Design a protein around this ligand. Sequence first.
Ligand code: FAD
Ligand code: FAD
Ligand code: BR
Ligand code: BR
Ligand code: BR
Ligand code: NA
Lengths: 487, 489
Amino acid sequence: SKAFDLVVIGAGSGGLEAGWNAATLYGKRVAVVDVQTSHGPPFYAALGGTCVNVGCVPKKLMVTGAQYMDHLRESAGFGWEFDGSSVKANWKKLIAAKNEAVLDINKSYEGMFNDTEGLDFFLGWGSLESKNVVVVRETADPKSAVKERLQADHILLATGSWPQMPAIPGIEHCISSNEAFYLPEPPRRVLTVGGGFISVEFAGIFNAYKPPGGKVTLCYRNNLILRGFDETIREEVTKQLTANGIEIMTNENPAKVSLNTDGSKHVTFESGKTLDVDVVMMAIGRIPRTNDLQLGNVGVKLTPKGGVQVDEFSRTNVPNIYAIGDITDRLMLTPVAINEGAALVDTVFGNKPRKTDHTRVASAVFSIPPIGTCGLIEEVAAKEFEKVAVYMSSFTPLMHNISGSKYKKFVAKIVTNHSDGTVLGVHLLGDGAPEIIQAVGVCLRLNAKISDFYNTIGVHPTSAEELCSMRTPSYYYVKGEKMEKLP
Amino acid sequence: HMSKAFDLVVIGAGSGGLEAGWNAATLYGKRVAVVDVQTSHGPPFYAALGGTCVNVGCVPKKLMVTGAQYMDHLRESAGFGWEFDGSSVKANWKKLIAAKNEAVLDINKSYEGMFNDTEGLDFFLGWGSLESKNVVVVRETADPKSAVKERLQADHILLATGSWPQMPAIPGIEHCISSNEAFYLPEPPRRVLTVGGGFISVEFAGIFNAYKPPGGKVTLCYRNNLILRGFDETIREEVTKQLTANGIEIMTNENPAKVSLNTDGSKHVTFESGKTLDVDVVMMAIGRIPRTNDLQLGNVGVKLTPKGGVQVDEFSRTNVPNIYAIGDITDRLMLTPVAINEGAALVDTVFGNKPRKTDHTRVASAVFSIPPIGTCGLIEEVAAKEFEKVAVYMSSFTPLMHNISGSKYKKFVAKIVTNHSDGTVLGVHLLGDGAPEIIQAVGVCLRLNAKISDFYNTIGVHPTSAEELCSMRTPSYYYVKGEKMEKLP
Ligand SMILES: Cc1cc2nc3c(=O)[nH]c(=O)nc-3n(C[C@H](O)[C@H](O)[C@H](O)COP(=O)(O)OP(=O)(O)OC[C@H]3O[C@@H](n4cnc5c(N)ncnc54)[C@H](O)[C@@H]3O)c2cc1C
Ligand SMILES: Cc1cc2nc3c(=O)[nH]c(=O)nc-3n(C[C@H](O)[C@H](O)[C@H](O)COP(=O)(O)OP(=O)(O)OC[C@H]3O[C@@H](n4cnc5c(N)ncnc54)[C@H](O)[C@@H]3O)c2cc1C
Ligand SMILES: [Br-]
Ligand SMILES: [Br-]
Ligand SMILES: [Br-]
Ligand code: NA
């Protein structure tokens, strides 16, 4: 039995930021619990969190790998010649390189714990025994053997989220992104289920690494993928994914999955349509990971949606117990979880309360081609402001007229409060969009106006300079209604 | 045949001249004439309708750098599992140039159509010069004795003829080319010396290095100790290493003294040190000078600076009331978006009743080296001369993807330079893939007087290189009244 200022359940993005800051900045005594010291089966996430182990870090590596299918083809337009029939994509090599990079990060976090005063790692499953006692056990079963009892002045819940699996017959024959990271072979035919960024990103990954004769299908239960993103970009990325060979089935939803005699999967949709694939990857959502924590022992209140309820300072209803990151079911992004954890520790252990700003958070989708975005989409702005202007620029860049990928239109949109020119949102589709958007996130914190963008001198030639060339709105929303001219 | 009269006559249909001309005609209803020497790209005069950027500048060079980047992509693809017959790879320079030529010519034709279509915006082909305060003469050649094609009466005259490569007066200079000729080489050189330490030499070194035939070698020489003067010194040193790591030989403290032809027709370069180098092409890229000689400025008394540019005030006005100058002819910042900004500001002031001067500070710009540079604002040694206390925030590391690609020499560098007395960001300097795209919105930030805390409070986009700009809270080191030191005293 051991005594700590702060015990963190979950060695993830937010949990490690909070623990390291509490220990090194404020000299506190910190314990951090996670169920696994390195990535992969059986529990997938591990020391470092979901992003490090089965998330942003490995998927970005795999999307980078998938982009070479485009680079090799497009090199031809610039004079590069080689034997195209000799090209093959070695998925096993990709997975091995990704595994080595992730494991290196796991080991680095191990040394961090070993090297840092007041920062201790405990392996196992943490749950709430009492208001000031975290118990660590051998498995997720609350009856498994106690390994540690950690008394804590402060408890931080930071267990992240988990893939949501729909309650359909045969759901057990589907995988999630967790298993996709470790497939022994690239699937020849795969269905990715869902319209969100994980489904879209993995569609592009599988599309590049598929063996000859392969086919990637993405299905989504409503009419247009990537809800919550700019509508122009949702339509365009649909078009550009299709142009690269991915089939988009909208208004379709699996009703059941069954096993074929050859090991493949027979999917039946609610519409009656059927599809045989080697892999069905469910990517319909991620839900807060709250079940193993025994929040009923202490009475931590959940929201109707299942997140741990928190105030703006990450405090639960139970004094001394806090929650940050995906478990609060708000913005499920690693930099947000990090920011929340740092704000929390500054509030609790320093003399300055700090709350995370969840507006104007820049983010990206590493689709091929990718999305970068920060701030409000125009239909959300139109409900908040009487007068909204949308500035739009959309064209295929010169290099893709030469590369032969003429379908790769770059889209740049700026959404303003037309009453005073304030930029409310910026939405980008095309090569470089995640890099372009970062400093736009800084601009939105300086209450940048559209005229601040267009009076800035461009860097030429770039895609980004499009953001500084838009003077005249393409159209407007007045009292919520879209119109080409002001009334 | 009668002369034609205009509110504004623009000499030079380039980046700045076309912005001014189009804006005056379409925004303010003025009658505009624009003069250029050629309607499409290439020899004999290289620049043409559209300007130096369009024809023999930013636009073609970026396409060629993009082509050159595939040498890296093809090799780096193997770390991610891509397999193909490496022995079959060839870089076909003739296809690259043919593709570039067709793209540039498409732009030429579209500008041709703009003039045909637009009321009050007329194009005249030939060589423009100043005869008097209100008459521009258009002649068949740069020779002021050549035949007169038109006389253009002008209430206002805009000088926007750009710049031209400078060639040193060494024996055998006739055996050398400039970037103009580089854009049209029939074959890629097996061995090439690029002379100069500035961005054009560095960028062409990268292009030639990727398209060189078997057994080729690219050498860049520079007469001083470190290439890319004016850029961040950490980045100057790193780009030197990364060019070297991709097989480019960088000769610093070396300068050609003479060039002669070997008996096989290759170029024998003797440096001032007595070193010798045999190459197939010597490309001089030691500077560009403003194109003033052919304008006959003596006819009206337009003053030049000691340097040679047309002297202008902050509003682009020469010492002659109704004669203005913008762009490279003013021999200042030679960048296409600065020329465009100056043109638009001038026209808003003269014809729009909305006076405006171009801000020449905090201009974002790029070098399309491999890998590239993006920068905006002051380098730290300049800031330390002006500010009592300067802080430097610095992140440098090989990104994870290049530990898998095999190009471990590709360190990404991000530096923020601040006035530490109040946190204001004075400059941001980037080296690495995507740096020119990242830096653009940084330029908007500096125009808004962003402080380091504005960057640090912004939540990162992960995983990106750009997010390093939003993760730096503690200075790596300082300058205190000019003196570099890890810690404040
Ligand atoms: C495929 C995929 C791709 C993503 N890509 C991106 C991206 O590009 N950018 C981005 O910003 N975000 C991305 N995300 C989201 C990002 O991964 C999460 O937002 C982030 O990891 C959440 O941080 P956190 O601190 O809430 O928890 P996590 O980082 O998930 O860490 C929670 C930890 O808790 C441990 N744990 C759980 N229960 C217990 C328990 N009872 N006891 C002990 N330990 C426990 C888990 O093992 C895990 O290590 C991606 C997610 C996925 C699934
Ligand atoms: C190799 C190279 C690469 C470059 N890359 C970049 C880059 O990536 N980014 C960037 O921002 N800048 C770049 N530049 C610089 C950019 O090209 C110039 O800054 C910009 O074009 C200058 O614009 P301007 O309006 O001053 O003149 P220009 O665009 O040069 O136009 C001047 C025009 O005047 C014409 N002309 C000259 N004399 C006469 C006359 N007597 N009568 C009639 N017409 C005449 C010329 O034919 C020419 O078309 C590059 C330059 C070079 C050489
Ligand atoms: Br929808
Ligand atoms: Br060739
Ligand atoms: Br700060
Ligand atoms: Na769905």
